[PDB]
Amino acid sequence: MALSDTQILAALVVALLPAFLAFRLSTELYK
Amino acid sequence: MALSDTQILAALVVALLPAFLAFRLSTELYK
Amino acid sequence: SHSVKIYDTCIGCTQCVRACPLDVLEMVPWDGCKAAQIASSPRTEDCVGCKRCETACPTDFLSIRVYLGAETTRSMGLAY
Amino acid sequence: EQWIKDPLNIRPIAHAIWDPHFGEGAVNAFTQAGASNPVNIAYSGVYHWFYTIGMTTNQELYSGAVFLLVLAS
Amino acid sequence: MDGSYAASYLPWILIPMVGWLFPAVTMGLLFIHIESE
Amino acid sequence: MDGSYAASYLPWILIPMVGWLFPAVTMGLLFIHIESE
Amino acid sequence: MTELSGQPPKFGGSTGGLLSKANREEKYAITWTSASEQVFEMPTGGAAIMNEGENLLYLARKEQCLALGTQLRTKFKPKIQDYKIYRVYPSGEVQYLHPADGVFPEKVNEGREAQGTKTRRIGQNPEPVTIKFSGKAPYEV
Amino acid sequence: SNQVVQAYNGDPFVGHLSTPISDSAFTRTFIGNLPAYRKGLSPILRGLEVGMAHGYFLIGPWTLLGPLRDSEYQYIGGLIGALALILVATAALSSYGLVTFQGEQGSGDTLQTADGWSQFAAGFFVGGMGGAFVAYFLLENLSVVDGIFRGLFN
Amino acid sequence: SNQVVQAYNGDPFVGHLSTPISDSAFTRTFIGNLPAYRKGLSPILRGLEVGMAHGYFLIGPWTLLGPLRDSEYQYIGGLIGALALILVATAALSSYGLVTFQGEQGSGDTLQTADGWSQFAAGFFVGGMGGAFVAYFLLENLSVVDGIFRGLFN
């Protein structure tokens, strides 16, 4: 009934793109 | 009735001098 | 570089000069044909050996020959 | 020396095998013609040649190998 | 894999020599030779 | 110390990463940035 | 001759252009005088906007420069026949290559010299037996 | 304008494109700060940096996929294979610097010089065998590393 | 003529003879391509090359003839003896370069310069202890090396 390892890895992959998008926002907020 | 290790090492030593003589022939054929 | 030799069978039809896309051939004056001109190749270090001058020539066994000799950066046609 | 005893059934051996990529099947299948090391069955005619010439022991044709090394030198 | 013949220790060092040590120094010497001026 | 949950192997590498590998390269990048000209 | 006067044409940039041979061994440069702001296809790849007036374009091989000269002389109704192809070294020297005599090589003028002209047919060439070890060529000698 | 891909370094006749993969700000601040490219280093240190990340990962494909993963000498065979690969690697690049930088000996950009590339070869060899031996030592004592990351030696 | 031994480098007053051992083609292309003599290297790389062949063979006389060949700690005592010898060796040659190249600091032939000989000392130490540890590691795991040369781990 608990979670699986593939759900945790999918959560890491689906949170990888907020890291890229926050990197884009931080870069354009610096300049 | 088979060979011995000293016969193999003597074969290597008696074939060492064709290596030196072919090295001499290759050097004088280059020049 | 290649060697472009031009023989005396040339009739001065200047097809080979306008066919070569590298400006090695050029028409010099002459007195051995009706057109009174013959092709000549001074800039043979720029010839790649493409033999496009030996496709537009009207004589039997065409009067211009390109003997493929040594190679270099120009004769191999390299942009690198 | 084991080929001249019965040259109708036993197989001649060219040389031995020493590549380190052999597993266990390739060692248990290449130990042919009665030899504990992996060998390679000779298909050239050197054994029938050396028997027809009159060579019996390995020592005389080893001495022929040393003689040909000197002749090549 | 072993050797029933005499001097079984000798292909144990001659197979890696002619396989690696001879062609590496041959290609090294040849690449130094054919690319020098 | 282990993990009864799914993917117990993952904090085993994420705790030293965010503890050492993230702040060392963050302080390295920041010290290179704030002291350059 | 020694100085290249011109402006670069309007071009977005390509990949088949000047490689690392340009700043190391040699490159080439074509200069021509346009009439309008038309469009020409460079042999590097794609199209470019030919600027008005005298413009300069850097290329990597002489064959690309002569292919551009053919495109300038045939594929335009104001036929541009006043282009100059130079060879630029990384040392800075500029060699006037084409049409260096001043007139095009397709027509004849006085001042040229017959270089590489034989006085025989190809059937009158010598045989490679008589010059078998002279080191020369059967067509040269 | 709003176009993100432009000509490389202004002039549009060099065969390259200023592109968000090629010539973005992040690329020219990350590739330009890699050890083979960042300014102010001797080639011995930058070769030592390049060598360590290459030695550290070459242990992997032989300890997990090599022929000695059957037996108990797994990491020893992995280290031996990676030491052979880095020895061949430094032989190749030291012979490259031996044959390429003979002659004119250009002054600037000291990595592309014969003494510079030989310093790079010495650095690559030290970092290569050191990264290989550290990855071997951290893979062989994996029970110790697991014990000091889980905290069971207390 | 047919004489094979001549004067050294033309002039017959230098105390040397151009000889098929001294000044043959093979000698001046083999000694001249040894690491201490071939051109285009920094002294750190050529010291690292000289150090490796010296560390690799110094394990031998103590693992086969040293006093620890009786017990099971044979190769450990051989490595310890060779590490002591290479440490004394690099102490001797670094002190040599410390005391010989003080003063005028001649420009050309960079090996015979104080910074050059100190680079040679650092290279000799790294290659020395590395060749010693590799020969120790390849002698201690000799069952592994015999298994991967005979091919019995498959």
Ligand code: CLA
């Ligand atoms: C990955 C696969 C692989 C590899 C690497 C090898 C490798 C080898 N096998 Mg092998 N083998 C394999 C698969 C493989 N095998 C398989 C699947 C089988 C079937 C079961 C066999 C069956 C087999 C037998 C039966 C024997 C070998 C032997 C050998 C060894 C050759 C001895 C040697 O070095 O001579 C040197 C190699 C050569 C001379 C060949 C190279 C020829 C070159 C390319 C041409 C010349 C180039 C140029 C002109 C000169 C070189 C230039 C250079 C100097 C710069 C060698 C270690 C033999 C052995 O143990 O040695 C006695 C042997 O008897 N193998």
Ligand code: CLA
């Ligand atoms: C040309 C003939 C010839 C050929 C094809 C081979 C082939 C072989 N020998 Mg071998 N051998 C030869 C002559 C030859 N041998 C001679 C004359 C001797 C006496 C010194 C030996 C002594 C010898 C030993 C002691 C061993 C081998 C082994 C081997 C095998 C592995 C390769 C190796 O390590 O060799 C390396 C060989 C040597 C270092 C010495 C021989 C070198 C010969 C004299 C040079 C041959 C010149 C050749 C024609 C040059 C070709 C030029 C061409 C590329 C243009 C391989 C089957 C090994 C084996 O059985 O493994 C299972 C092994 O342990 N050989």
Ligand code: CLA
């Ligand atoms: C012809 C000769 C030859 C020989 C003898 C070998 C031998 C070997 N190959 Mg191989 N191979 C060859 C040709 C050859 N190959 C060719 C032509 C190819 C291309 C098709 C391959 C492709 C290939 C692959 C893809 C693989 C092998 C592997 C192996 C090894 C199997 C066991 C192992 O993991 O070793 C362990 C590794 C070693 C023994 C490496 C040598 C390191 C030594 C011990 C260090 C000695 C250096 C020392 C400090 C210097 C001494 C100085 C000297 C002067 C004394 C074995 C040593 C397998 C492997 O894992 O090898 C890494 C493997 O996966 N080979």
Ligand code: CLA
């Ligand atoms: C902001 C909310 C938040 C907080 C406070 C934490 C806190 C923690 N997480 Mg975590 N996590 C989060 C969100 C958060 N997480 C999200 C959204 C995910 C899904 C990808 C995860 C996935 C995750 C895993 C898979 C693991 C943890 C673990 C942990 C613990 C150890 C730290 C660590 O290794 O994290 C490292 C976390 C990551 C590499 C991914 C999460 C990064 C998030 C998305 C960034 C949060 C942005 C943050 C607000 C920025 C602050 C800016 C501020 C300084 C100005 C720690 C309790 C570990 C644990 O349980 O150990 C016992 C562990 O294994 N987390």
Ligand code: CLA
């Ligand atoms: C927040 C994160 C964090 C984490 C995860 C740890 C974790 C640890 N601390 Mg620690 N510590 C922290 C914060 C942290 N600390 C802070 C903030 C302080 C200051 C108050 C301290 C002060 C402190 C002291 C005073 C001591 C520790 C010790 C320890 C270790 C106990 C077991 C041990 O001896 O390890 C053994 C050591 C290690 C595992 C070191 C890491 C070496 C790794 C394995 C090598 C990997 C490098 C590799 C080559 C590079 C890989 C590249 C990468 C990209 C993959 C443990 C690893 C004790 C200790 O002995 O640590 C040395 C100890 O005495 N810590």
Ligand code: CLA
């Ligand atoms: C090209 C296809 C291919 C592949 C994938 C393999 C794969 C393998 N072979 Mg193999 N082999 C091949 C062709 C291939 N072989 C051929 C043609 C032959 C000759 C006939 C052999 C002969 C052979 C032998 C004789 C043996 C193997 C063995 C093996 C295994 C271990 C070898 C090893 O450690 O590699 C080492 C490889 C490396 C060190 C290179 C790693 C490259 C990395 C991963 C690239 C990473 C790129 C990165 C992800 C990109 C991003 C980087 C950055 C930007 C982040 C492995 C599964 C051995 C075994 O035991 O089989 C199980 C073995 O004994 N092979």
Ligand code: CLA
């Ligand atoms: C007999 C003299 C002698 C000795 C003992 C050595 C010993 C060594 N050399 Mg070496 N070398 C020599 C002469 C010698 N060299 C000469 C004359 C040249 C000029 C061609 C070179 C050029 C050279 C280069 C370019 C490199 C070495 C390297 C090395 C070291 C490890 C690799 C090696 O060669 O495998 C041990 C093999 C032997 C001892 C057999 C010697 C046979 C020939 C003469 C060696 C030729 C080297 C060859 C080009 C590459 C070999 C590597 C190979 C194993 C993959 C080792 C300490 C490498 C290194 O680690 O440096 C940092 C390296 O990159 N050498």
Ligand code: CLA
């Ligand atoms: C000069 C004669 C001599 C010789 C041959 C030996 C030999 C030996 N002594 Mg010894 N000893 C001697 C005098 C000698 N001793 C004296 C005068 C004393 C004082 C009274 C001692 C006191 C002594 C003690 C107290 C002990 C020994 C021990 C030993 C043994 C091991 C030592 C060792 O590892 O050496 C290390 C040597 C080296 C690292 C140098 C190697 C030199 C190499 C081989 C030269 C190579 C040149 C090369 C071949 C040329 C070509 C190079 C290139 C061109 C190819 C060894 C058999 C030990 C033992 O256990 O005895 C069995 C021990 O405990 N000795």
Ligand SMILES: CC1=C(/C=C/C(C)=C/C=C/C(C)=C/C=C/C=C(C)/C=C/C=C(C)/C=C/C2=C(C)CCCC2(C)C)C(C)(C)CCC1
């Ligand atoms: C993040 C990221 C990335 C990256 C990734 C990767 C790929 C990484 C890698 C990593 C790695 C790959 C790492 C490694 C490391 C290593 C090291 C850390 C090493 C060290 C070494 C040592 C420690 C050694 C030492 C020594 C000894 C022991 C002895 C001998 C000598 C010497 C001294 C050398 C990318 C790019 C994608 C992008 C962005 C993101």
Ligand SMILES: CC1=C(/C=C/C(C)=C/C=C/C(C)=C/C=C/C=C(C)/C=C/C=C(C)/C=C/C2=C(C)CCCC2(C)C)C(C)(C)CCC1
């Ligand atoms: C052939 C010949 C010869 C020679 C011989 C001999 C004498 C040889 C030697 C040899 C040897 C003597 C070899 C050796 C080698 C070595 C090596 C190969 C080493 C390596 C090393 C390493 C691998 C290491 C690494 C490392 C580590 C591990 C860690 C620390 C650091 C380092 C990085 C360093 C003569 C002259 C007579 C003449 C002619 C012929």
Ligand code: SF4
């Ligand atoms: S094409 Fe032939 S005939 Fe015409 S000008 Fe050229 S060489 Fe003479």
Ligand code: SF4
């Ligand atoms: S080979 Fe080509 S470049 Fe040379 S003359 Fe003929 S057409 Fe012109």
Ligand SMILES: [Ca+2]
């Ligand atoms: Ca296995």
Ligand SMILES: [Ca+2]
């Ligand atoms: Ca003892």
